[PDB]
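Supplementary Note 2. Why include the ligand at all?

Several targets in our set were suspected to adopt different conformations when bound, so apo predictions alone were not considered sufficient. For every target with a known small-molecule partner we therefore ran a joint prediction. The input for trimethoprim is given below.
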Amino acid sequence: TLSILVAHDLQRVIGFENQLPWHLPNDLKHVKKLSTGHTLVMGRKTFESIGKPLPNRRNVVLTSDTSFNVEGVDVIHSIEDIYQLPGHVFIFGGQTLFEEMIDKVDDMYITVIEGKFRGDTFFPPYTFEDWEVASSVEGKLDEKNTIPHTFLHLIRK
Ligand SMILES: NC(=O)C1=CN([C@@H]2O[C@H](COP(=O)(O)OP(=O)(O)OC[C@H]3O[C@@H](n4cnc5c(N)ncnc54)[C@H](OP(=O)(O)O)[C@@H]3O)[C@@H](O)[C@H]2O)C=CC1
Ligand SMILES: COc1cc(Cc2cnc(N)nc2N)cc(OC)c1OC
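The joint prediction is reproduced in token form.
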């Protein structure tokens, strides 16, 4: 099963200067919970931002770079390769993978971050005409998690 995993704000911002625009530990716990034991496919800039492969899942990086051979990362050089990956595969970002994949995935796990951040990278527009809300769960706030957010799971109609 092929899924998107993304956090985006009220205007679909995902990213600023190759980093997440917000500090939201609870989103990152959500990401850990969902993707542990599965596979992640991310483009090269997302990989560099994170800087290491994430533990306890297959990390797959998409890059035209044929010298890319990183310890604990599988490399693919085409979108077409994503389909040969076994198991539950999460399209992990960033902008350019989302744009390529949004029409192809079974479902999306979206954290809607309920604020308006400066961004330089966006998730593509989508409509609920196309996507059934399987679930919608308000994120709990505390002093360390102070931005309202909602976890959506959307299934393509
Ligand atoms: N909020 C969220 O949920 C998430 C946010 N982000 C954010 O997104 C931003 C980065 O996004 P973006 O700039 O689009 O970059 P990406 O992370 O998507 O990666 C860009 C690169 O991916 C590689 N790539 C993508 N498509 C292909 C292809 N078909 N063939 C070969 N290589 C390909 C290329 O690498 P090369 O040039 O090396 O060939 C390309 O330059 C960051 O700010 C980051 O913080 C990222 C993930 C999630
Ligand atoms: C695990 O830490 C990171 C995760 C992500 C991707 C990501 C983050 N949040 C959500 N909801 N979905 C995603 N695909 C992107 C990151 O930086 C660009 C990360 O470093 C902080």
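The longest helix spans residues 25-35. Strands lie at 2-8, 13-15, 39-43, 58-62, 74-76, 89-93, 107-113, 121-122, 131-138, 149-156. Comparable summaries for the other entries are listed in the accompanying table.
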